[model samples]
Target: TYKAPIERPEDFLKDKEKAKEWERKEAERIEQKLERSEKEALESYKKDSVEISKYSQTRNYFYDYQIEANSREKEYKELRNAISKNKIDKPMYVYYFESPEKFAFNKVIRTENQNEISLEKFNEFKETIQNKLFKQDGFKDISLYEPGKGDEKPTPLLMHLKLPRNTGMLPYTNTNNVSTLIEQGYSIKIDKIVRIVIDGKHYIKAEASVVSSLDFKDDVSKGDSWGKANYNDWSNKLTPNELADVNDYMRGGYTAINNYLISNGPVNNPNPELDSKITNIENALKREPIPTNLTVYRRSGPQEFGLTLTSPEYDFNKLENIDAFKSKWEGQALSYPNFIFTSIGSVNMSAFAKRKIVLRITIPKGSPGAYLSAIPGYAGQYQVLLNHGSKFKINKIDSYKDGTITKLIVDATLIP
Candidate 1:
């Protein structure tokens, strides 16, 4: 038997500076972990490249080239227009899930190299690429994810998602298709996400809006011109110019991170210089002070949240019991080290599941989670990106079953 009283955030947060220090220390720790993971990932990439190049000495099945922007796909075009209009920025990395060829996705990462960077590496990579890659030209802020590397154990059950509404281009929108995954919208729930294991392979059912191919489209395989795609899956219409040094590496030396593809450089053969920049960044680690803007709302109101926003169709069929569902997270203090999207608007989820959930996240004074209103281009999702590693405690849970749809309100509070 176990018993303990839940600490009240009001009382515990009395020591404000202590709370910030705690957050800072934990943030720093995550930063170190992030650096170490990148160092290792870069090392792994190099070694695998050497051996792959040996077989490479045996062939050119892959090349240093990329096909031109071939699709005028509505999806790609929508993404670009969104960016142009400041709806959402091109995330450094986006999530997608697939299973058409079963383990073929895994094989793409096999060869001498497979399994690469973890989340921390993503933080590291984004810092360099945000300013170095494509200039925003005074538009949206630069932020993206690191492609998660391969692992033996099961991948994360619930994956993080990002911006970009569908443009009707590829199968780039969110659907229950279970066959296609593309750069799409944001929402995180643990039901039928990318974590469901069918046979034995792992792919993500996630997506984000990429700034690539907005000027192109690929309705059918015929008039398509986006070049021979860098990787078979998760390519999402990225071009050579945008991908730059990562062209070949994504082909062989790949990682199965968060079931998303990372465009790390070097393929077929290892090059110390290319990998060195990543390896040497460990010492370059810096303190991450959380930045805050009082200009926005964390909760959506009629206006949007702490102004109110809206979202729809969230399901949790596997864990049907309301209490059982709460048991998984209740009392647990968690750090979601990625962009977890939360919506403000309501939904008619009755069509999706017998039961559903709406998370009411309460960010204490010092908790690092953020309101999406601040991040331009949120025309579609009434959402917000809780800061990476934002710590929270499952405060309470309530049921709404007596009403139209069986639903639950999960209260997650940001803790010091």
Candidate 2:
């Protein structure tokens, strides 16, 4: 038979003491276990970190190359247009993106080569190219990534690169040495490095500027005229040279009007009385307050997967009438809610913004355990935005093992 605790007070005290001692020992054991696991994780991170550093540098080289190539293409198109429009009288200096060094990098690195090369040999090739080609120009800063896993085939290498925005008009080079895996069914995702979430939709924020003024000048001089007697006369008394010059001048004027017409014309045929692009431009040029209104252009934002908000405070009604609620009630409502939400895509926040939002993220069912482990700063508070333009302060993350798969739940707060 079991005895009740109706004995002496000292007996009750003894039982309590035993309970506390057991709790202390259990806690100590957990602490030690955690410490050991943390050390192992740190060691693994060192290797992965080195690999990432190299990968980032390598990727930047590719990114820089792409940016420069795009810039050069734009410049080429502009020059071509000027030549076609007879905007330039003399031989204009034109640059080409195709160069020997560019071809070399493309052939050896980014493109598929018949010869098999190890990481060591690859590094050597990278150094040679950097010194001979990439470094000669203002592209001084260069780096490449070495994958963390050694045994895996280094076929699909992820890369990113950044050069100065001012590095304009640099020669374009094709790194034909791109990942062969792309040919064998791999993807190359070129996207913004950062993104945001608003109203349950994701967005990539960017800014662009348009020229406010339009200026055109006629630079064709009499000295540069075709060798013909009558400069102003447009008769068949004109030689082929004079005829070509006249054609070019008239074409320029016609082309200018044609461009405007194409840009601001009606979808269908319209009468001259109804067309008002010239008037619009004239009014735009002469503004009452100088027409410097800031433009807000919105496009479809980027998409991210992970963590659906399942908290009550995230209800549509609550979000819409947020202003009506009392401070204390709102504050109480904004307190951290515990739940799991998840999506397939990765979520990220930018450095400087108006405010950070709260997100309650989770790992979806059937996902690999590594996916849960791969989250940035797991179990820690990170800044994110909520769907309805509110501060999302992540309180903490919790993970659990469900059979073979691991799942994570976040307890986060949405502060308005």
Candidate 3:
């Protein structure tokens, strides 16, 4: 039997108010200290007359020595771009943990010597660490902030020392979506990866109105057939919002894995013939395509790489026609929160008879989805999770007949 903690101490009961006041003051003191530290850090990184010369020296030294100054300048731009574009709210930590698998608590500390390190010093230091941890090419600096520095308990530990950081505590965007499933008798559990499947869409006369419904019961050769599965099981096959999220994640993972493979080529010769064959196959594969139509630029601050499309016409053939079915890769299995090849473009369907163009999208074969089949792949290695949902309410019912709805209207919109 375990004894529970007493709500109030028998001896200190009378002085509880005083204790509360002391705790409050201590908290304020710690917060003030943390705030001061944060300000100092931002000031250090800000461009200024005194720091400009030092930064220039750092840039010139690197260019003059190892890589050319032009290359150094390019790298500095990348770093500035990465940091500015990073979505962090506070000066967070980007330190390497003992196990570089995922960021763990209490394992964050500055990797480079802070006192001796200049901006360039920190940049070089962080660049090396990031190169080892993340496969991306253009990262410049990493900083660690541990709030609990003394006899006081620590604040929440956040990974990544950049601006606009995610607090990781905000309400999810799809609350109604997940809740609706639970209300409809779906099970809920911590770390429970909820998946929803969609089937070949068909029209149904529900209440005398033609409405879209999935052919979950009929195996009408729509590629996938979860014949007569209940609503819960049927819903697990295709989820549009969730698919969008997973696709985004897959894009990032795709970059990471592609960079890794490119960096490390075939090393040892088990057999030169086999190695050559493997190299040929790898070389035959194509790099994933980038969205080329919409290029968004960051208006202010450093000239960082903004979310922009390099070309005017981006192609996405997978989502082009009504005949397309939501198909899963049979052999190459990707996990949750992953992406597939994607394209974004406008379509003018009227060009045929109505003089309109409709968008055609297609994902190339042997891309991220192909690489995800292996269990030890990079996506599984990092335990990031993603989910999506949607909900709608009926304000008024006009009529009901033959297990169908008539004269009814629904608002297909989300609160957020």
**Residue 79 displacement in candidate 3 (angstroms):** 35
Write model 3 residue lDDT over 105-168, tens digit each, in one string.
Answer: 1222223222122344333323323211111111222212221222121211122222222311
**Candidate 3: residue 67 Cα off by (Å):** 49
For model 1, residues 136-222, the per-residue Cα lDDT tens digits are 111111112222333222332213333333311111111221111122221122222222332343333322222321111112121
Model 3 bad stretches (over 4 Å): 1-276, 287-416
> Pairing residues by index, what is the TM-score of model 2?
0.15
The models' CA-based lDDT, in order, is 0.29, 0.24, 0.22
Candidate 3 backbone overlaps, count: 45
- CA lDDT, candidate 2, residue 262: 41
Per lDDT, what order, best first? Answer: 1, 2, 3
Best model per TM-score: 1
Tens digit of per-residue lDDT, candidate 2, span 233-346: 322433454334323323333344344344444345543632343333222212211111111101101111111345433222333322222121211223211112221111
Candidates 2 and 3: which is better by lDDT?
2
Q: Tell me the RMSD of model 2 versus the true structure.
A: 32.0
Error of 1 at 177 (Å): 59
